[PDB]
Ligand SMILES: *Cc1c(COP(=O)(O)O)cnc(C)c1O
């Protein structure tokens with residue numbers, strides 16, 4: 001369970017922390033060249049920095065196993081299509097370069113990110129009939145924890161953000177994974193100001209959405225609820241629905257009034273970085289007993305169980 | 319002053335620049351204390367200004383070798399940094415000193431200048447709330463950018479009231495904080511291109527006018543200028559319009575502008591540093607009034623480029 005998975009990770013991290021490979025700290029792919037992540041440089045005029053005109057996606061590899069890589073690359077392709085972007089490399093070649101980068105980095109628990117930007121020329125002065133010269137950036141990095149393992153044992157502190165709302169879909173489509181974190185960064189600052197660690201943003205219409213890079217799932221009377229609109233369709237949320245269906249628990253991706261967060265039995269977040277992240281304190285008050293809930297634990301175990309299932313992952317050779 | 323005169327003098331200076339041997343005449347950038355040609359300027363990939371676009375920016379201008387309202391732009395950059403808990407990593411006068419030096423080295427007489435202040439290498443997510451960040455500074459000067467080409471400014475451009483996208487509300491991102499998160503604006507540009515236009519006008523989502531893809535919108539109706547107050551960036555060119563209009567006896571109202579006023583307006587013109595005053599003569603595939611640039615637009619156009627040579631609004635750059 002939690003102790004077993006975390007213990008094995010801390011052993012793997014000890015091996016990585018005393019490695020001599022300079023790429024063990026990170027590796028990046030820029031225009032066909034592999035460089036240490038610290039030595040990664042992009043053009044200043046790239047429209048992915050100029051106007052954040054890009055999409056991105058983050059797969060993960062745990063214990064040397066890429067977790068649901070097909071799903072993330074498929075979502076990256078869908079996001080590119082929605083923003084009139086093209087994946088600059090074939091999907092299978094992108095997969096192969098990712099395994100090669102991870103293999104050279106020797107990292108077994110890694111944070112992997114792919115970024116597809118508009119290029120050096122913007123959309124303002126664009127002659128119709130031409131397409132854009134989109135750019136591709138990729139890098140591998142040690143596994144990032146939105147919630148540390150020790151905190152996952154006891155649950156974290158969350159607030160319902162009052163000073164900031166989620167960017168509506170009519171402005172930016174949340175189903176397109178974007179790096180425009182204006183509202184999310186504001187939510188993080190508010191959470192820090194209010195003695196918490198995780199912000200939950202409202203839909204602006206008294207509905208729940210998501211937080212600073214994670215989906216929110218409520219548990220109430222044996223049924224799981226998660227917001228449908230205004231949110232990114234997370235892969236970890238997709239894994240939660242898969243695990244729950246195998247456990248006989250049904251998840252309802254529907255409109256969630258914000259009051260349900262205060263009346264819920266359990267609350268937990270989901271993202272590729274932290275994984276399953278239970279929340280035990282809401283608005284400086286414990287959820288129920290102040291401890292991680294039962295349904296949260298079953299989903300936690302199932303999520304990390306399918307990390308070793310060949311149907312959801314494949315092994316990397318070092 | 320005179321539209322033909324100003325454009326003629328500009329194109330003459332541009333002819334000198336286009337056949338120059340200086341490799342920096344195409345652009346020069348300041349990255350971590352180093353001066354480099356604009357084309358080969360590189361930033362760290364892990365910079366949180368690229369990772370999560372957690373930054374601010376601002377654009378001063380240099381016309382005919384004169385920095386235009388640099389103090390106003392630098393003050394707005396500091397105010398934007400303060401609002402999102404950022405600090406200008408260098409003293410205000412040193413930032414001014416390098417900017418004049420960069421323009422002088424580039425030999426560019428009509429320049430687009432941009433300053434970018436990013437969060438740094440460490441993000442805000444996993445950061446101890448008690449420590450401060452080592453913010454980064456990037457700046458570069460580039461040949462003057464035209465959101466509207468001079469030939470088109472004589473006759474005006476085509477604008478649409480965006481139907482597929484709304485402006486990001488202030489409750490999500492404060493528009494007074496000049497940001498590069500152009501999700502809605504890029505969507506507006508795509509819609510304008512799809513609808514046979516060049517400039518999108520975005521609504522606030524509440525049947526009110528706001529702004530466009532990097533420019534303020536100003537309507538003139540029955541001799542009075544109207545411009546949206548909330549949901550927009552307080553542009554320096556818009557502030558210059560208010561100064562010029564006040565000097566011309568024209569009344570400007572920074573108030574809430576219902577979208578209906580754009581269809582009932584006598585003249586429409588946009589404002590941004592990258593281009594100056596940009597009249598709009600066709601809105602939603604329909605002529606505005608006479609199909610030509612209006613009188614009030616021309617009076618404001620002349621006054622805007624007039625104060626570009628006024629010592630109260632500008633200062634001269636000593637070249638080599
Ligand atoms: C990608 C993303 C998610 C979902 O993360 P998965 O690991 O894909 O479940 C949630 N919120 C934001 C802002 C995201 O960008």
Ligand SMILES: *Cc1c(COP(=O)(O)O)cnc(C)c1O
Pocket residue numbers: 377496497529530531532533534550551552553554555556589590591592
């Ligand atoms: C830069 C910008 C403007 C124009 O500001 P000036 O100081 O007038 O150039 C207007 N709206 C937005 C959104 C901008 O980014």
